Design a protein around this ligand. Sequence first.
Ligand SMILES: C[S@@+](CC[C@H](N)C(=O)[O-])C[C@H]1O[C@@H](n2cnc3c(N)ncnc32)[C@H](O)[C@@H]1O
Length: 209
Amino acid sequence: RLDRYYYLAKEKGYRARSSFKIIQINEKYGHFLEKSKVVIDLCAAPGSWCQVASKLCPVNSLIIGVDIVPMKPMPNVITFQSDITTEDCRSKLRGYMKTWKADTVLHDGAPNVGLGWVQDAFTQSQLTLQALKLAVENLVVNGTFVTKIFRSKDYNKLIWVFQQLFEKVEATKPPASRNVSAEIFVVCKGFKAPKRLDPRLLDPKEVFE
Ligand SMILES: C[S@@+](CC[C@H](N)C(=O)[O-])C[C@H]1O[C@@H](n2cnc3c(N)ncnc32)[C@H](O)[C@@H]1O
């Protein structure tokens, strides 16, 4: 909570304790950030995962962060304000991406407005599906997708959809997540980059019953 990771992150200049979650996931799952010349960070504010990517990615990497709340600028990182569930976000990201494909798409989204446990879990699951849809549109073949996901009655359905689009799909809970009961992280590796993509594979009405 206000624990060891909170204060280490402060002292190192990271904007949030959650910096350690992606550092630890990256260290266990093959240092994908060090291999990523283009990174999209979804639901990024205040921006500590963007800071991690800025530190670990090759120099001259393209790092793009998006959140509903404004983020303070970071050197050599692009940030903008949008709702990742919207066409607005879909269009702004495409302008920054130009002809590039992303090596890695990160997602650490969670609802801001509390609506009770059941609906907060569903909002988070909807966020995760939208983040996945953006990753499917932007990832290079064999790219990586890392997402926070809440434990809920829709977790299994999201995992299944992930397994249709990635060679390897693994749940993880790094040390900096140990005492955060709601959350698991899913590392998706080897984006299949299908020529034929099913609209239903990413349709919320089909995924969520
Ligand atoms: C857990 S924080 C992300 C922390 C970030 N990984 C870091 O290290 O600084 C979750 C963020 O998701 C954002 N969020 C929730 N729903 C969103 C949406 N629909 N579109 C964009 N951002 C959203 C919230 O504004 C919040 O900033």
